[PDB]
Design a protein around this nucleic acid. Structure first.
Ligand SMILES: [Zn+2]
Ligand SMILES: [Zn+2]
Lengths: 67, 49, 1129
RNA sequence: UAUGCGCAUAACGCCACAGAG
DNA sequence: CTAGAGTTGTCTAATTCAG
DNA sequence: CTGAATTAGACAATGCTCTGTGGCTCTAG
């Protein structure tokens, strides 16, 4: 839904790296290079951001007040 | 399980249907009746069998 | 490949770029057409049935005529329309249309409005037309009658529906209910079969007979059987209103046509000219009718109308000739509409019967998919609607009958047609079928099944929700029958039904699912040009001479119409020409035509003939015609005479005619979501299709708009790193159902043997697989709280100490609020009295209120008495919850193991799930090892790997590929790492296989399964505990437990379990006469003594200790005058 | 019989679907 | 305005045949 | 002029425990 605060396996803070990851991928990096530029060295950290499906932007199209 | 086992051999009823024939039904007419007699080692018996 | 092909946009590999795309979350301008074709059978069948099939069905209802005092009155239905769902009249709204979100949240039915233009006539002249309202029929969502039709995904977001929303369902009382596709026989095709139970049907009936399932434009269905009799005579079974009638064949064949007897003779011996037994048999059948004084067609019609008028119930002023025409229209080959075509099709069915009974053709297997097709929802809807329209006319006649018996003042009908209001209203009998599934018919609708026709289409996740629209059910009568032959996977369902996707247990092999490429023919076309096209080819007409012997010819059938005969040297040319025309779309041949040419082997093979099918409801699938280079839809019977190829290498010149689109097209939509499924054992793929549908996933996007009973939500789901390409074709990252887990396969803790599994405690304490379940309880003060006076409204009496700071001023909890046990749940006050009541929360689970929606009636005039509270229960993973991988490896969590005690790798990494390696040898899920190597490579390199089956051969192995990936990442080729011990500190001597496996959390939690009963409620008949954990009841100590505890020799332990802890009652017997029924207590003057009523002596009464069910037993035997005499010593 | 405080409220079957082992 | 496509496998009732 | 074996029909059985939801239980005359 929303980016997890910590990695599940080790407790590395990964929640502050989602917008940086999207800005690196829009700047035409490879996903492996974009995960290197964030310092995600263990693949436990690296699947937390690689495989994240961000359902909150789809879930906020139904935003109620529309005002 | 339906073992065909060739033509020259025989097959009988296996498993729970045969176990039900023995126990629950005690039937006068089972599906695979059979007899089994050894023959003698006499040469006259082997020329007669 | 091929332009305009529906499978040309299937991706070459899974991408992962849509998750991070800048246009993510912005709704598209158009719905993804991959998802809209999964429910296309449902929608298109309903679209036909409501627009065009309804006009054909009301043209098929005969003009209903009956008797007044003096003059015949004729009723006919000129037109019937179904209107889209709108608000009732007299309703003040800005929008007249009603949308499914209201009917889904208010728990109403999404109803259209059926109205008909009934015409009436007295004395043969039409006096006036009446537009008249009949009832409300349900509407399938996203039909041509739904109000969500033709809307873009932004407009579906505006109306609280899903973007990418397909609908094949009805909302019946707030519940999405789908009509699953039943297996019917192949329509309009003579199925020659052998059934020994037909021998017990007449005096000399054989086991041979030809069935026939005739449907007329998808609004009628009539089963009929020819039977073979040992003297070569054929009886004709036909069913009229669920009861069987047996007619000799000569009566039917002599009534249908005005032919001579010799001409009927030449049509029955037409293939087998020289078989003199058949010649004597059909001359005997023609002689049977001659012996009973029926020498013309008119005399046969007179005799048959005389014999069938009581069961048939025409008006008493029809002739007997017309009363027989009625049964030949309602009962005999109804797909034909001409009587000579009925004659020729019935002669073909008889010739196939003669070839079957003479051992010359073979039995059409009814269990093979060759001889089967599907029952679509529009067909069932339209058949039931035609039956209810006919019943409505009969109800109008009963209304005139009641007004002729009761109000017979002889008022003429001069627009006295408010008696239509006195007719039956078909809202409730129509909704009963869609609400229960039970079919209450007088015809039976040609089905062999009475129930289970509508099933709740629940939305546990999206993988389960797709499976209701792809399911093809064999029948409900077959689950009760203990035979293993309808449950076989037969090879004729290659590419049409999936081999793996079927349940386990009782519906295994019966509840089948379509493959991803398979599709149901739902289009309807005019086939008036096709027989003249065939006669432009070498097909001689059925009247003309075939210019060769009929024993060297093929019978031609076009949709159950026998067209003619083909010279067998021309018939492969005609079959190839028709396939050419079909795949090139040249001479208005439909692309869904089955051109079957069953060849003349000269051996007891299938009955030969050139069979041509264009009707709907058949299964059809795309292959590629290699001769033309274009994509062809081939059918189920057509497939068994084709040599398709799977791979490019398998194509041989002169052998293979066709080729599949892609080699994994034999599998379902759901079975194509299993990674590396050709490396797993096949029961482990059948288990994954089941438990992929039981997964706590991400069901939907509209949580506040959805009011359904339970709804399981995974909190942070992840896209799989290793998934097939069908996962991205169907955009399954809209609704992901799992999380990637660092799974290490190690025997470390003692708690993971025998299917159990270990989860890291610190991963669980971070967000791993956390969830929720949203329970929605719909509270109605009219329905439940029926005390009287009809004036209950939610509210509090102000100053009530039962609701202070715990319910709001409307007697209804706060939306942030928590609910423990015994908290006030809602309060309602009586307005005509003043007394306020409060209702308490009786569930044992602490929930948080999510939203409270308040509902009106359909008009906006309802009062504040319907409400729908939705509550969130947390449900994070505990000890005892069930997880699964994507390979059939289920497992209960045994232990939440600390992170300091978890084996850390040399990279500084613990696992978060430990897997025991003994789940591999007996189960042989090698694809889980490949998935872990592939997911580790996908994480390391930042990739997403393709796990589609059949893409790795033995030359280019999967383990070689993913080992080269891991070697390129600087890891081990074989997937193992140097783990250390978190308990010992020492490096473990073995070299432990670790990876990334995508786990699924199943909805089976121990919080819904534990129960404990100390004392409680008892059954009011037997005084034993009651059953259920929601009623807080007892568990059984049944018969086999009694047996196994007798085998221990523990007799006081049975006496405990089965007498002291169920029902230890104390009865009073008379010791003299031995009777429980005889003692009786004295009416008081104290004393309290008993008297035996029999012997009138108070001395002989003493207590024994019996079960209470023994007292119930002796009372129920006394009800049959059976005396139970006790020996009490 | 259960809950709540001797008192107040609630006191079930039959089908059909779905599921677990 | 009150109302009613199984499968064995034993037991019994019908069903034909000379004395 | 009646006991005789035979054959068709009737009938009784077909694993165990457990969890849910939903409709109907007297609508038709
Ligand atoms: Zn990490
Ligand atoms: Zn007595």
């Amino acid at each position: 839904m929303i980016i997890p605060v910590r990695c599940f396996t080790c407790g590395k803070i990964v929640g502050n790296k989602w917008e940086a990851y999207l800005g690196l991928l829009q700047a035409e990096y490879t996903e492996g290079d974009a995960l290197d530029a964030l310092g995600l060295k263990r693949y436990c950290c690296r699947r937390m951001l690689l495989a994240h499906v961000d359902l909150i932007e789809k879930l906020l199209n139904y935003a109620p007040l529309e005002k | 399980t339906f073992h065909f086992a060739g033509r020259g051999e025989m097959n009988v009823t296996l498993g729970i249907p045969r176990l039900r024939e023995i126990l629950m039904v005690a039937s006068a007419n089972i599906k695979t009746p059979m007899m089994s007699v050894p023959v003698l080692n006499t040469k006259k018996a082997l020329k007669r069998v | 490949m091929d332009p305009g092909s529906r499978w040309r946009n299937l991706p070459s590999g899974p991408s992962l770029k849509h998750l991070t795309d800048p246009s993510y979350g912005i709704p598209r301008e158009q719905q993804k057409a991959a998802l809209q074709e999964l429910t296309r059978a449902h929608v298109e069948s309903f679209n036909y049935a409501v627009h065009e099939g309804l006009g054909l069905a009301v043209q098929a209802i005969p003009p209903f005529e009956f008797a007044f005092k003096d003059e015949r009155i004729s009723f006919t239905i000129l037109d019937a329309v179904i209107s889209p769902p709108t608000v009732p009249k007299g309703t003040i709204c800005k929008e007249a249309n009603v949308y499914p979100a209201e009917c889904r949240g208010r728990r109403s039915t999404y109803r259209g409005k059926l109205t008909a233009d009934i015409n009436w006539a007295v004395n043969g002249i039409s006096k006036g037309i009446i537009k008249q309202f009949l009832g409300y029929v349900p509407i399938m969502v996203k039909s041509k009658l739904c109000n969500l039709r033709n809307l873009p995904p932004q407009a579906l977001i505006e109306h609280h529906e899903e973007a990418e929303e397909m609908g094949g369902y009805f909302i019946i009382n707030g519940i999405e209910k789908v009509i699953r596709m039943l297996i019917m026989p192949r329509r309009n095709f003579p199925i020659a079969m052998i059934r020994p139970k037909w021998k017990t049907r007449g005096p000399g009936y054989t086991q041979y007979g030809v069935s026939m399932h005739c449907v007329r434009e998808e609004h009628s269905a009539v089963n009929m059987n020819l039977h073979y009799l040992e003297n070569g005579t054929v009886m004709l079974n036909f069913i009229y209103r669920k009861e069987l009638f047996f007619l000799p064949l000569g009566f039917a064949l002599k009534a249908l046509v005005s032919f001579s007897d010799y001409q009927i003779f030449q049509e029955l011996i037409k293939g087998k000219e020289d078989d003199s037994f058949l010649r004597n048999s059909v001359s005997q059948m023609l002689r049977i009718v001659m012996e009973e004084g029926c020498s013309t067609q008119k005399q046969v019609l007179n005799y048959l109308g005389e014999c069938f008028r009581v069961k048939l119930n025409v008006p008493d002023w029809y002739p007997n000739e017309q009363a027989a025409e009625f049964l030949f229209n309602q009962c005999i080959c109804i797909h034909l509409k001409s009587n000579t075509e009925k004659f020729y099709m019935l002669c073909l069915m008889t010739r196939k019967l003669f070839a079957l009974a003479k051992g010359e053709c073979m039995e059409d297997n009814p269990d093979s998919l060759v001889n089967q097709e599907v029952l679509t929802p529009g067909q069932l809807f339209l058949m039931f609607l035609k039956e209810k329209l006919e019943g409505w006319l009969v109800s109008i006649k009963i209304a005139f009958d009641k007004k002729a018996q009761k109000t017979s003042v002889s008022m003429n009908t001069d627009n006295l047609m408010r008696i239509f209001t006195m007719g039956i209203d078909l809202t409730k009998p129509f909704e009963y079928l869609f609400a229960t599934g039970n079919l209450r018919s007088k015809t039976g609708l040609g089905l062999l099944q009475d129930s289970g026709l509508c099933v709740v289409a629940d939305k546990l996740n999206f993988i389960r929700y797709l499976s209701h629209f792809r399911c093809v059910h064999r029948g409900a009568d077959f689950a009760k029958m203990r035979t293993t032959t309808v449950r076989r996977l037969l090879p004729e369902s290659w590419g049409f039904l999936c081999p793996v996707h079927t349940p386990d247990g009782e519906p295994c092999g019966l509840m089948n699912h379509l493959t991803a490429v398979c599709e149901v023919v739902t289009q309807f076309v005019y086939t008036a040009s096709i027989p003249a096209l065939l006669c432009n080819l070498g097909v001689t007409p059925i009247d003309g001479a075939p210019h060769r012997s009929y024993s060297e010819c093929y019978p031609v059938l076009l949709d159950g119409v026998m067209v003619g005969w083909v010279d067998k040297d021309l018939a492969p040319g005609i079959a190839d020409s028709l396939r050419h025309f079909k795949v090139l779309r040249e001479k208005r041949i439909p692309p869904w035509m089955e051109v079957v040419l069953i060849p003349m082997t000269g051996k007891p093979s299938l009955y030969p003939g050139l069979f041509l099918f264009t009707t709907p409801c058949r299964l059809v699938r795309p292959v590629q015609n290699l001769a033309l280079g274009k994509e062809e839809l081939i059918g189920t019977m057509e497939q068994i005479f084709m040599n398709v190829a799977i791979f490019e290498d398998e194509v041989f010149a002169g052998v293979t005619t066709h080729q599949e689109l892609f080699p994994h097209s034999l599998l379902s939509v759901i079975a194509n979501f299993i990674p590396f499924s050709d490396h797993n054992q096949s029961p482990r793929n059948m288990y994954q299709c089941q438990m992929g549908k039981q997964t706590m996933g991400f069901p939907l996007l509209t949580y506040q708009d959805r009011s359904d009973n339970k709804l399981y939500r995974l909190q942070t789901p992840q896209s799989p790193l290793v998934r097939p390409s069908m996962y991205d074709y169907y955009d399954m990252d809209n609704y992901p159902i799992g999380t990637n887990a660092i799974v290490a396969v190690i025997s470390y803790t003692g708690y993971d043997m025998e299917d159990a599994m270990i989860v890291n405690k610190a991963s669980w304490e971070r967000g791993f697989a956390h969830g929720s379940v949203y329970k929605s309880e719909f509270i109605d003060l009219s329905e439940k709280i029926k005390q009287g006076d009809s004036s209950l409204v939610f509210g509090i009496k102000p100053g009530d100490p039962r609701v202070l700071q715990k319910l709001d001023d409307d007697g209804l909890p706060f939306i942030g609020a928590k609910l423990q046990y015994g908290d006030p749940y809602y309060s309602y006050l009586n307005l005509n009295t003043g007394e306020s009541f409060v209702m308490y929360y009786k569930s044992k689970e602490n929930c948080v209120v999510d939203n409270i929606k308040v509902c009106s009636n359909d008009t906006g005039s309802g009062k504040f008495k319907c409400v729908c509270i939705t509550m969130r229960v947390p449900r994070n993973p505990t000890i005892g919850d069930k997880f699964a991988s994507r390979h059939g490896q289920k497992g209960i969590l045994s232990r939440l193991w600390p992170a300091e005690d978890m084996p850390f790798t040399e990279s500084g990494m613990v696992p978060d799930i430990l897997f025991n390696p003994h789940g591999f040898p007996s189960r042989m899920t090698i694809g889980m090892l490949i998935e872990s190597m592939a997911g580790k490579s996908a994480a390391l390199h930042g990739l997403c790997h393709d796990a589609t089956p059949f893409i790795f051969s033995e030359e280019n192995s999967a383990l070689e590929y993913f080992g080269e990936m891991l070697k390129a990442a600087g890891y081990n080729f074989y997937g193992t790492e140097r783990l250390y011990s978190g308990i010992s500190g020492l490096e473990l001597e073995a070299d432990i296989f670790i990876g990334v496996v995508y786990y699924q959390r199943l909805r089976h939690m121990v919080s819904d399964k534990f129960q404990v009963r100390t004392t409680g409620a008892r059954d009011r008949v037997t005084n034993q505990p009651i059953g259920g954990r929601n009623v807080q009841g007892g568990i059984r100590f049944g018969e086999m437990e009694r047996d196994a505890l007798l085998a221990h020799g523990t007799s006081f332990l049975l006496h405990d379990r089965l007498f002291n802890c169920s029902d230890r009652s104390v009865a009073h017997v008379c010791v003299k006469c031995g009777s429980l029924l005889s003692p009786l207590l004295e009416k008081p003057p104290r004393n309290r003594k008993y008297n035996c009523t029999l012997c009138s002596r108070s001395d002989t009464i003493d207590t024994v200790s019996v079960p209470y069910v023994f007292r119930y037993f002796v009372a129920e035997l006394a009800a049959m005058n059976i005396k139970v005499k006790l020996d009490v010593v």
